[PDB]
Design a protein around this motif. Structure first.
Motif: not given
Ligand code: ZN
Lengths: 1032, 38
Positions: A104-105, A109, A124, A289, A292, A476
């Protein structure tokens, strides 16, 4: 069985017949992009430049990579938001830019901005959607009076870097698209909440069948309702949806069992400040992050989110000013919690004591002036072990609890308990907890609930645990799918109860109830947390370990000179801001990924040249301060090559010189090549091939070298591990080592002072080791200094010191104090400790004698017993690792020209060993007038040591000294002050230089605030106290 | 157990330290192609 085959049908129904019918596509948007493979610029300066005219935005190509590696692409999206939009449904953009799912990270992105410079939300792999309209008739601010809108998206085309695999990706921007990621038609979609609830319910139910047993009737009453529902949902008749949900409701509302645990869940995403990406990328990762996190605080209330590493808050403050004021609005509300006041999540064992204290201090200071919070515990989930001096520092710094999880990866042993009382070497204790999920990044699955409840190691007396969830290690955060599957596990008979909460309240109530329940049976652990994994992190990238000590060992000198110069010269401005910047830069390079040296080649390259720059800048503050003392005491004396080394043998902080000033050292060359060095205090006999083979302690008359062994033999191990190449050492390597028996003495000479030097050479197939053995007049120690031209990868070098003294345990030092570890490893768990840390010295002693070895920059070693050729006990072998060359994240790591220094002493007590370590680690300076130290202690009994005389941080002009006990026995002393600060008072503080006392902690002073001249001090073993001296 | 972790080391040795050193590349060839979707 029929049920297991019915689970597959249900999962495929979720994946194909339910999931696609959630986002109903309405219309697609025109797109144009501009690419940039260079270094990125600040978004605010681009938007205002991208609104007037100065960008062209040539359209994209459907089905081609939209960037290059380590590059940035800006995309201008324009849609229409047509009429006839579904009623009571939300409208959102969907960005499908060729995502994968696994990391994911790790890979690409993006971040979406409004057309003024304000962040909307980040994009993401598993969280790629942006709210336009919120299913309630209210639109975002980026919507015109009609349906027109315009969005700017900054997309980072970060490559996916494998963990342990040779690659060229972690070096520099290539300008090529290695991993292909398509564009694929950004679009607009309406969200169906009912289908989404149905998918969530299915997910909750079907994940519980893998973890239950076919013995409770719930396993069967569930697997029946799951079957009845998916037999009723026909994706070609929407009216059947309402029929399908009612079938999967007779089982969703069942109150949890009576004895079920209770978990306190909080959103948490761990961001490694630098690992598998350059440090210039972590800033954007923090921004994404956090954005989010706030976009999930309006999907549901009562959702809480934690965030550590005050450095991340600072990085956020500078890059997204608007996103900072939204955080502070949540902080005062109570749903956003900053935890564990520290600059970064530092390493747990390598930094010295002053590093940890300064980290805590700078963190607490940032959390106060900016956010206005005072944390109560230390947040350190990811670290390669813990020093064992942590409990005392934490308790004396105002902390109440402690958090860890990384100690689950041990290769051999599992710890007994999850919640316990951790007592250090001093005796102070701190309440510690491991999250039972055995990981910080959970996805709030049924698997994790089952595991948490079935793994928790104290279910008989605690029934309370913590639970962290979110996508971590690269940012994320949590996704909205996790939050809506939390409300299903609130009761859900069959699984633990789950509820949101804050860490402070959980820790308070959990500790108090476990105490009042267990009694004097509370689990307890005394000592250090040895990490049974990743042994090579002590020597992975040597220039990082050498840089951490050399910079910090000279910050001590620079800060001490600021005290001496601010008392002598009446006008001298101490440069607070430069020192603060240097300290912050240092504390950033002690993260748990860059001090162990397990990041990509790019990160170390930047961090390496920072040590070079700050070392140079530091030795200009020094010489500029010494210029002030030189004019204040204009005729006393000046010596070149001085070294202010705390706790010498006669004068603690007096600047001793390098000229030895004894009688010459007689050298007796022999005809066979051997030589014999002999000063007043030692009789060293060097063989034909380096390798001192006998050392006499002429004072006592004891051999110091284990018989039939030679001191200085080099080994080279063959370490090619299974996984984690730059991380850990096989035990197999310890079997394959081969000594370098070839060698010779190149030169034998004496110098001007009178010391004797021997110069040796050694080689293994490409590389060269040239050692210099020195004996100085009037010193009972032997000095070694090696220069290595390491060229061969996949090898590991180390030197050995065979000692003629046999004991059952070895003695190392901690940040403040000492520890002992076994020498002969008996059980299976002890053989897992075959390599260990050692700050600045290792001592092997007995009831009445001992031998010690002190080093300059090594940080790693291992001990084992030695057996003579006739199979009688000979002594103990001390090997210390010098340099290794992995290949996994860095193809060309540790190539060429390393230096090493160390020394060997005979020491009955521990005081001369501490003096030698301090004297070998101190930096050198020029033209330093020799004047007595201002603060001095006269030892009545024991060995108390003043460590870090420095100036106050309040700018008021006070002095702060940090003194401790470094022998393991109670120490009584009294304070003497020089004629420059007489009439001053002294008092006791905590480690943060504040008037705070704690009832469970002894104090140093006897009394309160009194006159400094003559105040007495009592220190129980391994105590750390802090004195503050004020003008009045 | 130690053996199961020693199996992974052996498999990775097979895959990276032994397998590539079987076909020693000497020279590469010029190539030209004609395509046909029918
Ligand atoms: Zn980490």
């Amino acid at each position: 069985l029929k049920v297991n085959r019915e689970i597959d049908r249900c999962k495929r129904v979720m994946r194909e017949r339910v999931w696609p019918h959630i986002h109903q596509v309405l219309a697609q948007c025109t797109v144009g992009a501009v690419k940039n493979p260079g270094e990125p610029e600040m978004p605010a300066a681009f938007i205002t430049r991208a609104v007037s005219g100065q960008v062209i935005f040539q359209p994209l190509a459907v089905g081609e990579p939209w960037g290059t590696s380590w590059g940035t692409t800006w995309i201008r999206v324009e849609g229409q938001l047509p009429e006839t939009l579904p009623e009571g449904r939300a409208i959102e953009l969907v960005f499908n830019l060729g995502w994968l799912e696994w990391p994911v990270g790790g890979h690409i992105e993006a971040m979406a901005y409004r057309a003024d410079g304000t962040v909307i939300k980040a994009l993401h792999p598993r969280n790629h959607w942006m709210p336009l309209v919120s299913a309630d008739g209210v639109k975002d601010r980026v919507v015109n009076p009609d349906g027109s809108f315009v969005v700017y998206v900054e997309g980072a085309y970060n490559p996916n870097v494998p963990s342990f695999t040779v690659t060229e990706l972690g070096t520099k921007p290539t300008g090529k698209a290695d991993e292909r990621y398509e564009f694929s038609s950004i679009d607009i979609a309406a969200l169906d909440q009912d289908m989404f609830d149905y998918w969530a319910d299915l997910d909750v139910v079907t994940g519980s069948l893998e973890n239950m047993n076919d013995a409770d009737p719930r396993y069967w009453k569930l697997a029946k309702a799951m079957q009845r529902s998916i037999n009723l949902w026909d994706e070609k008749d929407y009216n059947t949806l309402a029929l399908a949900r009612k079938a999967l409701d007779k089982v969703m509302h069942n109150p949890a069992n009576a004895s079920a645990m209770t978990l306190t869940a909080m959103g948490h995403s761990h961001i490694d400040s630098a690992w598998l990406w350059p440090v210039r990328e972590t800033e954007r990762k923090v921004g994404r992050t956090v954005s989010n996190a706030l976009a999930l605080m309006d999907i549901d209330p009562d959702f809480t989110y934690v965030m550590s590493a005050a450095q991340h808050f600072a990085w956020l403050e500078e890059r997204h000013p608007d996103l900072f004021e939204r955080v502070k609005a949540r902080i005062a509300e109570g749903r956003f919690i900053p935890v564990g006041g520290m600059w970064v999540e530092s390493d747990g064992t390598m930094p010295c004591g002053e590093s940890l204290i300064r980290q805590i201090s700078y963190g607490k200071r940032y959390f106060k002036e900016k956010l206005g919070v005072v944390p109560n515990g230390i947040w350190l989930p990811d670290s390669f072990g813990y020093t064992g001096a942590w409990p005392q520092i934490a308790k004396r710094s105002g902390y109440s609890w402690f958090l860890t999880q990384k100690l689950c990866w041990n290769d051999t042993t599992r710890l007994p308990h999850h919640s316990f009382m951790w007592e250090g070497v001093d005796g102070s204790q701190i309440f510690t907890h491991f999250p039972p999920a055995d990981k910080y990044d959970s996805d709030m699955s049924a698997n994790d609930m089952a595991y948490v409840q079935s793994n928790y190691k104290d279910k008989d007396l605690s029934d309370r645990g913590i639970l962290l969830f979110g996508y971590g290690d690269g940012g994320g955060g949590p996704i909205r799918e996790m939050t809506m599957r939390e409300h299903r596990f609130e009761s859900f008979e069959g699984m633990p109860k789950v509820e949101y909460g804050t860490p402070d309240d959980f820790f308070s109530k959990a500790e108090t109830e476990m105490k009042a329940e267990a009694g004097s049976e509370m689990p307890r652990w005394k000592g250090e947390f040895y990490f049974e994994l990743h042994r090579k992190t002590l020597t992975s990238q040597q220039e990082m370990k050498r840089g951490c000590r050399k910079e910090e060992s000279m910050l001590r000198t620079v800060e001490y000179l600021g005290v001496v110069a601010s008392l002598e010269s009446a006008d001298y401005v101490y440069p607070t801001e430069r020192i603060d910047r240097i300290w912050k830069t240092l504390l950033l390079s002690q993260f748990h990924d860059i001090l162990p040296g397990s990041a990509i080649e790019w990160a170390h390259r930047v961090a390496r040249e920072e040590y070079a720059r700050d070392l140079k800048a530091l030795s200009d503050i020094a010489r500029d301060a010494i210029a002030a003392i030189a004019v204040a005491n204009p005729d006393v004396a000046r010596i070149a090559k001085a070294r202010i080394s705390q706790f010498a043998d006669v004068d603690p902080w007096r600047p001793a010189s390098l000229v030895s000033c004894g009688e010459p050292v007689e050298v007796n060359r022999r005809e066979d090549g051997s030589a014999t060095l002999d000063n007043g205090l030692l009789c060293v006999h060097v063989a034909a091939d380096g390798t001192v083979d006998s050392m006499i302690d002429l004072k006592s008359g004891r051999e110091m070298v284990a018989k039939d062994h030679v001191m200085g033999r080099y080994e080279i191990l063959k370490d090619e591990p299974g996984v984690f190449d730059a991380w850990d050492v096989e035990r197999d390597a310890f079997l394959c080592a081969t000594a370098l028996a070839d060698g010779h003495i190149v030169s034998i000479e004496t110098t001007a002072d009178g010391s004797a030097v021997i110069v040796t050479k050694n080689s293994y197939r490409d590389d060269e080791i040239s050692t210099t053995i020195t004996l100085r007049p009037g010193k009972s120690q032997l000095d070694f200094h090696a220069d290595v031209e390491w060229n061969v990868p996949e090898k590991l070098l180390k030197v050995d010191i065979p000692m003629a003294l046999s004991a059952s345990r070895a003695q190392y030092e901690c940040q403040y104090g000492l520890i002992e570890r076994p020498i002969v490893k008996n059980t299976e768990g002890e053989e897992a400790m075959f390599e260990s840390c050692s700050h600045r010295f290792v001592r092997i002693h007995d009831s009445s004698y001992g031998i010690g070895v002190a080093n300059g920059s090594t940080y790693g070693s291992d001990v084992s017993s030695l057996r003579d050729r006739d199979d009688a006990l000979a002594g103990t072998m001390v090997r210390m690792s010098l340099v290794a060359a992995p290949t996994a994240p860095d193809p060309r790591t540790d190539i060429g020209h390393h230096e090493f220094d160390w020394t060997v002493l005979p020491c009955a007590s521990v005081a001369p060993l501490v003096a030698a370590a301090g004297e070998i680690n101190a930096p050198t300076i020029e033209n330093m007038p020799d004047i007595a130290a201002p603060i001095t202690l006269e030892p009545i009994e024991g060995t108390p040591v003043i460590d870090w005389i420095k100036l106050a941080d309040d700018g008021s002009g006070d002095i702060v000294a940090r003194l401790y006990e470094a022998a393991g026995a109670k120490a009584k002393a009294m304070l003497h002050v020089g004629g420059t600060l007489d009439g001053w008072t002294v008092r006791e503080t905590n480690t943060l230089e504040q008037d705070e006392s704690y009832p469970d902690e002894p104090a140093g002073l006897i009394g309160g605030k009194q006159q400094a001249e003559g105040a007495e001090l009592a220190l129980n073993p391994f105590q750390l106290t802090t004195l503050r001296l004020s003008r009045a």
